[PDB]
Design a protein around this ligand. Structure first.
Ligand SMILES: O=C(NCCNC(=O)c1cc(-c2ccc(F)cc2)cc(O)c1O)c1cc(O)ncn1
Ligand SMILES: [Cl-]
Ligand SMILES: [Cl-]
Ligand SMILES: [Mg+2]
Length: 215
């Protein structure tokens, strides 16, 4: 039968207003609070994401790991006109749900959902996708991929002074190598935002790591 992610999309389509991103976020959070948990960033951490997005008003955001498109809705709804989000989702079924979710939210013109592995796609961003540098990166894919993909971003010349990395799940499931690395690096200025795992009474957190250039 249907998957959890199909159930979430359907619930959104039947309980949100088309073209209304806030209603989409609310529908998802209700579903996941009342019916079934799912690994969306959630409202607690989402509120911190919102605050970050509004501070930096990034023109170009890369997201690693889309899932059902919750975080992509969350960020894209706060982008300025003309600003854009690219999100890399290697799971094809998740990629399809994410696209449908963004279409329902009316945010399809702001977001490009690429179905491929981040390690394969990151090296194509400059030449294929005409990226110069990224303003912000949201990390939310496999937790053992945050560090290697961060180092790949730098290798490929995609980070600039001031590029904001914002990492989900640095407590649960945790990203110990990434977290130790950025906190130890003179090339990052880090801030920890303590919060809660989505839809749970469990502590989690976001890490912001602002790239400072080589050193
Ligand atoms: O990105 C891919 N999976 C989700 C990564 N995200 C997570 O695993 C994740 C997990 C949890 C979590 C927390 C507590 C718990 F008890 C169980 C899970 C929370 C979150 O907020 C996440 O973000 C992926 C899929 C695929 O098929 N191929 C390549 N990549
Ligand atoms: Cl999400
Ligand atoms: Cl929550
Ligand atoms: Mg997460």
């Amino acid at each position: 039968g249907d998957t959890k992610e199909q159930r979430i999309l359907r619930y959104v389509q039947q309980n949100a207003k088309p073209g209304d991103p806030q209603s989409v976020l609310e529908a998802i959070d209700t579903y996941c609070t009342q019916k079934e948990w799912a690994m969306n960033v959630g409202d607690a951490k989402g509120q911190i994401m919102d605050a970050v997005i509004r501070e930096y008003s990034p023109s170009l955001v890369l997201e690693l790991g889309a899932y059902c498109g919750y975080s992509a809705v969350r960020m894209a709804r706060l982008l300025q006109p003309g600003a854009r989000l690219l999100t890399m989702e290697m799971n094809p079924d998740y990629a399809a749900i994410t696209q449908q979710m963004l279409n329902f939210a009316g945010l399809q013109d702001k977001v490009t959902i690429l179905n491929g592995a981040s390690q394969d796609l990151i090296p194509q961003l400059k030449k294929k996708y005409d990226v110069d540098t990224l303003d912000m990166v949201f990390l939310d894919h496999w937790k053992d991929r945050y560090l290697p993909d961060t180092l790949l971003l730098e290798k490929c010349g995609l980070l600039r002074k001031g590029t904001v990395l914002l990492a989900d799940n640095v407590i649960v499931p945790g990203t110990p190598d990434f977290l130790a690395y950025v906190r130890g690096s003179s090339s990052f200025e880090c801030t920890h935002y303590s919060s809660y795992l989505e839809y749970m009474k469990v502590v989690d957190g976001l890490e912001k790591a602002i790239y400072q250039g080589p050193s």
